[PDB]
Scaffold this active site. Structure first.
Site, PDB file in Angstrom:
ATOM      1  N   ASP A 103      19.587 137.700   5.425  1.00  0.00           N
ATOM      2  CA  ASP A 103      20.629 137.183   4.450  1.00  0.00           C
ATOM      3  C   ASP A 103      19.621 135.775   4.005  1.00  0.00           C
ATOM      4  O   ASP A 103      20.198 134.573   4.100  1.00  0.00           O
ATOM      5  CB  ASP A 103      21.885 136.448   5.139  1.00  0.00           C
ATOM      6  CG  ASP A 103      22.845 135.748   4.525  1.00  0.00           C
ATOM      7  OD1 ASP A 103      23.063 136.103   3.270  1.00  0.00           O
ATOM      8  OD2 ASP A 103      23.535 134.854   5.092  1.00  0.00           O
TER       9      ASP A 103
ATOM     10  N   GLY B 154      31.531 128.656   8.481  1.00  0.00           N
ATOM     11  CA  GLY B 154      31.104 129.768   8.644  1.00  0.00           C
ATOM     12  C   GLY B 154      32.192 130.976   8.929  1.00  0.00           C
ATOM     13  O   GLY B 154      33.370 130.703   8.587  1.00  0.00           O
TER      14      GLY B 154
HETATM   15  C1  LIG Z   1      27.910 128.611   9.216  1.00  0.00           C
HETATM   16  C2  LIG Z   1      26.576 129.060   9.728  1.00  0.00           C
HETATM   17  N1  LIG Z   1      25.626 127.852   9.787  1.00  0.00           N
HETATM   18  C3  LIG Z   1      24.255 127.728  10.504  1.00  0.00           C
HETATM   19  O1  LIG Z   1      23.923 128.509  11.389  1.00  0.00           O
HETATM   20  C4  LIG Z   1      23.716 126.409   9.971  1.00  0.00           C
HETATM   21  C5  LIG Z   1      23.348 126.217   8.559  1.00  0.00           C
HETATM   22  O2  LIG Z   1      23.514 127.436   7.764  1.00  0.00           O
HETATM   23  C6  LIG Z   1      24.754 127.166   7.104  1.00  0.00           C
HETATM   24  C7  LIG Z   1      22.699 125.189   8.307  1.00  0.00           C
HETATM   25  C8  LIG Z   1      22.391 123.940   9.358  1.00  0.00           C
HETATM   26  N2  LIG Z   1      22.066 122.641   9.124  1.00  0.00           N
HETATM   27  C9  LIG Z   1      21.219 122.100   9.755  1.00  0.00           C
HETATM   28  N3  LIG Z   1      20.931 120.812   9.067  1.00  0.00           N
HETATM   29  C10 LIG Z   1      21.487 120.940   8.046  1.00  0.00           C
HETATM   30  C11 LIG Z   1      22.007 119.866   6.886  1.00  0.00           C
HETATM   31  C12 LIG Z   1      22.711 120.115   5.709  1.00  0.00           C
HETATM   32  C13 LIG Z   1      22.932 119.067   4.754  1.00  0.00           C
HETATM   33  C14 LIG Z   1      23.779 119.208   3.632  1.00  0.00           C
HETATM   34  N4  LIG Z   1      23.567 118.032   2.957  1.00  0.00           N
HETATM   35  N5  LIG Z   1      22.943 117.316   3.743  1.00  0.00           N
HETATM   36  C15 LIG Z   1      22.331 116.152   3.067  1.00  0.00           C
HETATM   37  C16 LIG Z   1      22.772 114.978   4.055  1.00  0.00           C
HETATM   38  O3  LIG Z   1      21.744 114.290   4.222  1.00  0.00           O
HETATM   39  C17 LIG Z   1      22.353 117.881   4.615  1.00  0.00           C
HETATM   40  C18 LIG Z   1      23.365 120.964   5.932  1.00  0.00           C
HETATM   41  C19 LIG Z   1      23.409 122.264   6.875  1.00  0.00           C
HETATM   42  C20 LIG Z   1      22.382 121.950   7.916  1.00  0.00           C
HETATM   43  C21 LIG Z   1      23.047 124.183  10.699  1.00  0.00           C
HETATM   44  C22 LIG Z   1      23.827 125.464  11.208  1.00  0.00           C
HETATM   45  O4  LIG Z   1      24.125 125.752  12.229  1.00  0.00           O
HETATM   46  C23 LIG Z   1      22.948 125.843  13.393  1.00  0.00           C
END
Ligand SMILES: CCNC(=O)c1c(OC)cc(-n2cnc3cc(-c4cnn(CCO)c4)ccc32)cc1OC
Ligand SMILES: CCNC(=O)c1c(OC)cc(-n2cnc3cc(-c4cnn(CCO)c4)ccc32)cc1OC
Lengths: 338, 325
Positions: free
Chosen positions: A142, A29
């Site tokens: 977004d 982030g």
């Molecule tokens: C930077 C701000 N991001 C956020 O708020 C944010 C977000 O957006 C960018 C996403 C998640 N988030 C929850 N579960 C996730 C699983 C994966 C994932 C990737 N590859 N794989 C396969 C493995 O099995 C799984 C990726 C992101 C995940 C959590 C966050 O923070 C709350």
């Protein structure tokens, strides 16, 4: 054939943040890193957004509190779920639901574009999420393929409300938001904009990605993409139904007011196609508008205070007590032990 | 990098796990070909690791060789990096060693000859693999070797020294443990010594419960040599696995070594070895011209050396022309 499995740079021991055990980075982030972690007590998997406030001025800190309060507002099956917030003198920890499937866009690269029957199912799930947000005076701003996640059953979960903001019907917003390809033409021009109509355009680029496996507007440089967004012109592959082309062609319209509202998108002929969906119309109706004692007994046996648990839930402070209740509750729906 | 596209591959099953990557078997939708794809999550990379794979990708472009895995196309998305490479039906040598036990020296030589030709080819091109282990040795449908995972590979100029640690610890030359600066090709050679021991014995020359135990073992430079091993082979290994780097054989001496020359004479081996010291195929272009794709843009893809959906279909079809399709 006896052998040992040695790790080249001897890997250090895992970090733990109070019953959470950090595994791997799963996101990056502006001022955060997202790490997958395991709740040692409930064995559940979670995401943790980790923010180092030392490097933040006072403005950034308010924007983050705004994000957190927005997240508290959204408990929705297709919105990532906030389990608990932890703060230390130096760090902010956001423990949110973990989506096994990952980005939808990468998933499409692996398995190809969605048959419209499939795209309709997921888009319905997305819209129920966004409508729930808009009905509660929030805009994501977004909405991109990268912020659309899949659980183990490949159901949508929208995530990363960092650019999200509260709004009142008819306000204008001044700050830029989001990834450029999903940006409505006003953002490029820089005009003030109405929030939900800019999400609608972003939802338009989303639908095109789902059914076609391509972007409507794309360019080698920002100027080139900017040209393509303003032209309001895009390819339509031959396999797409005329009802879908109608929907998308009317969502991605350069005049913000000429864009459809969220209400008639739910009524659009393309949405109504296929078997009729009662559950969908139900979640849409719900947008305008108890004491799982099994988990409660389980938490007491682990020595968690029965009275304090109830206080955490009623007070709605996302703490060590409320999160274990929520997690044991999600596990209890899965029909696993306690 | 270059943008990824939906509906060009269909990824099926995991075939390897790496530090920050997964390798999955996938099929090229246009040509129905089977390929391997290393998938890397860029969120897991600092700025240093990102450059590291760029170096790896740059090195794979330099090598087109029948015993080195071939990189077909490079794709990137917001969060992922895709390396689409040649798929080796036989799989890991390690797997084969587990399933079937040690290799008779006759076959060990056949495989080993193929390995050194690739390693020597790299060295001739100012490249060092640095991570040569049974796990990075693959077999195609003809049971021919293919070298893989140039994750640690690095460029060098002869007589340059390199400073960073590389590769799997059992295959690490004693200088890497010590942390000394090292001549690249000499560590590839020790690592190849361990490979040979693994092929012929089905055992590891050095091993320990802890890294410190194993390290002690490598630094002693002492190891068991079975009674079933040929006197010629033992010589070769004993002269590859030498603690003083300079005292190890050169790759030239390895190819001319008495063990290699055993058996029936090999014209094809010495030919490939000679090739290392110092073809446009228009047939497929018309086949691609048949797919209606623009000849001008494809040729620009090939000259420009950008590995895209055009380069993948060309390289794959080119393999069909070798296959006699
Ligand atoms: C930077 C701000 N991001 C956020 O708020 C944010 C977000 O957006 C960018 C996403 C998640 N988030 C929850 N579960 C996730 C699983 C994966 C994932 C990737 N590859 N794989 C396969 C493995 O099995 C799984 C990726 C992101 C995940 C959590 C966050 O923070 C709350
Ligand atoms: C993370 C670093 N890995 C790499 O570089 C890397 C790599 O590391 C050694 C190997 C491959 N690779 C190519 N073809 C393969 C076939 C099999 C296989 C397994 N079983 N079978 C059928 C018999 O059971 C076939 C396994 C791996 C294969 C690709 C890679 O990415 C380029």
């Amino acid at each position: 054939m006896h052998h040992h499995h040695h790790h080249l740079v001897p890997r250090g021991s895992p970090a733990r943040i109070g019953y959470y055990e950090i595994d791997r980075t799963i996101g990056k982030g502006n001022f955060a890193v997202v790490k997958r972690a395991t709740h040692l007590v409930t064995k559940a998997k979670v995401a943790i957004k980790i923010i180092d406030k030392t490097q933040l001025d006072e403005e950034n800190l308010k924007k983050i509190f705004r994000e957190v309060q927005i997240m508290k507002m959204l408990c929705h099956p297709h919105i990532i779920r906030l389990y608990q917030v932890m703060e230390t003198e130096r760090m902010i920890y956001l423990v949110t639901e973990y989506a096994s499937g990952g980005e939808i866009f990468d998933h499409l690269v692996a398995h190809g574009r969605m048959a419209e029957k499939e795209a309709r199912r997921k888009f319905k799930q997305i819209v129920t999420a966004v409508y729930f947000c808009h009905c509660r005076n929030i805009v994501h701003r977004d909405l991109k393929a990268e912020n659309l996640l899949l659980d183990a059953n490949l159901n949508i979960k929208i995530a990363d409300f960092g650019f999200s903001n509260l709004f009142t019907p008819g306000q204008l917003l001044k700050d830029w938001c989001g990834s450029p390809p999903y940006a409505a033409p006003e953002l490029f021009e820089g005009k003030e904009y109405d929030g939900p109509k800019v999400d609608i355009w972003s939802l338009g680029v989303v639908l095109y990605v789902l059914v076609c496996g391509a972007l409507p507007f794309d360019g080698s440089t920002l100027q080139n993409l900017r040209a393509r967004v303003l032209s309001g012109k895009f390819r339509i592959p031959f396999f797409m139904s005329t009802e879908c082309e109608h929907l998308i062609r009317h969502m991605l319209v350069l005049d913000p007011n000429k864009r459809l509202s969220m209400e008639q998108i739910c009524k659009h002929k393309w949405m109504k196609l296929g078997d009729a969906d009662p559950n969908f119309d139900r979640l849409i109706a719900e947008c305008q508008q108890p004491l799982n004692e099994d988990v409660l007994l389980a938490m007491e046996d682990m020595g968690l205070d029965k009275e304090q648990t109830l206080q955490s839930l009623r007070s709605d402070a996302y703490d060590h007590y409320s999160a274990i209740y929520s997690l044991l509750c999600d596990r209890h729906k899965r029909h696993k032990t306690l």
